Amino acid sequence: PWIMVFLVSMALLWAIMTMVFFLYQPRSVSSAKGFSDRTVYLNWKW
Amino acid sequence: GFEEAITLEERAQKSAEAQIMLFQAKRENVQFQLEAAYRARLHHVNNEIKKRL
């Protein structure tokens, strides 16, 4: 049954591929230190 | 970061208020310069009168 073995093995290898694809830890370490310098004071007239 | 951004906006508003102070000091300085030039021309007139005497 080499044809069914080939099809089941490749379907399982693709299933393992899409299991690993969603195996990640989303690290929300987006620091907001840029806003400490984004604000600019109003320029005067000289 | 959000609290620091709020305080920086407050500092910007205070900078705008001190800009108003700058413009008032500008017009005061212009009046000071004009009055000082009036004093010099008064001094020049008095010095010339003393020289004639």
Which spans in chain B are helix H? 2-52
| Contacts of A3 by beta carbon, 8 Å cutoff, 6+ apart | none
Q: Which residues of A touch chain B, with CB atoms under 8 Å apart? A: 31-33, 35-36, 38-42, 44-45
Tokens 């010095």 belong to which residue?
B47
Tokens 């694809």 belong to which residue?
A21
Q: Which residues of B touch chain A, with CB atoms under 8 Å apart? A: 1-2, 4-5, 8-9, 11-12, 15-16, 19, 22-23
Residues of A in contact with B22 (CB under 8 A): 44-45
Method used to solve the structure:
cryo-EM
From the CA of B15, how many Å to the nearest CA of chain A?
7
Tokens 């290898």 belong to which residue?
A13
CA distance A3 to A8: 9
Dihedral angle of Cα B4, B8, B11, B12, to the nearest 10 degrees: -170
Dihedral angle of Cα A37, A38, A44, A46, to the nearest 10 degrees: 70
- Report whether B5 contacts A37 (CB < 8 A): no
- Report whether A42 contacts B16 (CB < 8 A): yes
